[PDB]
Structure formats: C-alpha cells, structure tokens
C-alpha cells in the first residue's frame, strides 16, 4: 500500500497473508480475505504459479511474533473458470482457497463480511485498501499491515478514455487514482473495505494497477468486484 499508514493491529481481522514456501521459510506474496473458517478469497493470479501456499490469519507484522497469528496450509484451490492469466483485463480475477484445517475465530481472526449480490457503489464511496504490499515503487514489502483511504471511482469515470478505458469492466471496482495512494505489489488478493450503513464490507479483491506504476494519476487501483461473484463463491463452497 502506497501512501497509507500502519493499521491498528488486528483492526482488519479478516485480512490474511498468502505466502509460498521459500527455501526453509515462507514468503508473503498476496493478501486475501477469510470468508469461512476454512475458506479464503483471493485473486486468481495469486495462484497462477503452482507453488506451496499457506495462509496466516491474525497477522500484523510479517517478521515478528505478534502472538495473534495462526498458520494453516492451503489444501485445495478453486480458480474461476473464466480466469485467463494472459488477460487480467478480461476480469474473473478471483479464487477460493480451502484451508487444511479450520482456523479458530477470535478477536484477531474474523470472517469477512461480503456485500449483497450485485451491489455497486456510488462514485467517491469511502473505502480502505489494506495489505503488506510495497509502500513505494521498487520498495520492499511493508513489515506491518498498512491501510490507505481509497475512495471509489465509478465505472463511468473509470472506464472513460482518460482513465482505464475499456480495460476496466463493470465486474471490477476502481478506487484511488490520485497519483499518491494505491495498492502495490504484495497487495493482490487483498480486500478493499468499504463502509456501508455502519459496516465495512469487502467489495473488492485487489487485482492490478498501471504498467506505469502503482500510484499513477488517473490509473486507480483495480479490484475484482466481489458482489459480482456471490453466487460463484456460494457454488464453490456448497460444492464442498
């Protein structure tokens, strides 16, 4: 997250860290949202590489023991059938991860709240992106969970030629684009929390930014619109 600030620890209890086995340890690669005690929602591209993955719930500092973490391996992976690694702009950047075991829910580990099917936010809706991604282009991962206020940019504006053009689809949510705040490498798969009627819900799954950089004016961070995949998520979980 570029232009953000350290989140209060465990203030986003559904945020998870998706990591792959790296040598004798593990390396954070993406964010994710815990949606069931044994299911995590993330971006499809986060699992394009068939590596060994694990999820860390209740995490805050990736390199320090916070006393609130739980580590669970990713057992099964279900990627949206329409996802095409060669065309992220086509959309469908979403995948569900079934965990090896169910994590224990507490104050640090909570199920993410999702929006009702089909809900689309009005322009400039209040949201926050969270994650351990880079805080600057060419930088390193953030050690502590970061958050940045990223108001939405509606489809009409976001899909305009000045912004993303047709690259952005109605199945996506845009947010930010002021050239200062944005998601960055390491934030993919993570949530875009938006406040609606007193409750923060995960309306987006971090997907991409401009090829020109993370924080680029008129190139808001783009997220998969969670509300467009409610039935898909339920079908996958129900198929157990």
């Amino acid at each position: 997250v570029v232009g953000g600030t350290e989140a209060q620890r465990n203030s986003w209890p559904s945020q998870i860290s998706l990591q792959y086995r790296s040598g004798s340890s593990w390396a954070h690669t993406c964010g994710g949202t815990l949606i069931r005690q044994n299911w995590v929602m993330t971006a499809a591209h986060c699992v394009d590489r068939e590596l060994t993955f694990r999820v860390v719930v209740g995490e805050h500092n990736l390199n320090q023991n916070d006393g609130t973490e739980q580590y669970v391996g990713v057992q099964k992976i279900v990627v949206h059938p329409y996802w095409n690694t060669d065309d992220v702009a086509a959309g469908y950047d979403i995948a569900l991860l079934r965990l090896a075991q169910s994590v224990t829910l507490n104050s640090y580990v909570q199920l993410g709240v999702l929006p009702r099917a089909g809900t689309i936010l009005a322009n400039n809706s209040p949201c926050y992106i969270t994650g351990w991604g880079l805080t600057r282009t060419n930088g390193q991962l953030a050690q502590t969970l970061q958050q940045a206020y990223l108001p939405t940019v509606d489809y009409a504006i976001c899909s305009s030629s000045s912004y993303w053009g047709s690259t952005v689809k109605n199945s996506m949510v845009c947010a930010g684009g002021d050239g200062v705040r944005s998601g960055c490498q390491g934030d993919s798969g993570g949530p875009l929390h938006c406040l609606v009627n007193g409750q923060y819900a995960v309306h987006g799954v971090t997907s991409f930014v401009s090829r020109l950089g993370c924080n680029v004016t008129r190139k808001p961070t783009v997220f998969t619109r969670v509300s467009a995949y409610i039935s898909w998520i339920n079908n996958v979980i129900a198929s157990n």
């Binding site: 690694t85 702009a89 690259t167 390491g186 930014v209 090829r211």
Partner: peptide, 28 residues
C-alpha cells in the same frame, strides 16, 4: 496493466501482464 502480487523473477516473461522483472529480482 501490472498485477499486484509480490513474486521473485529472473526475467520479464516470469512476470504477469505488463509487469517487468526489476533488478532486485521481483516483479513490478
């Protein structure tokens, strides 16, 4: 576009979409 996953790489083709492999060995 360039995806926001943090991953090691050896060449630009190892990175997704329009992302390139930085001299530090990571996509961006």
């Amino acid at each position: 576009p360039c995806t926001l996953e943090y991953m090691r790489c050896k060449q630009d083709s190892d990175c997704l979409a329009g992302c390139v492999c930085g001299p530090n060995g990571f996509c961006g």
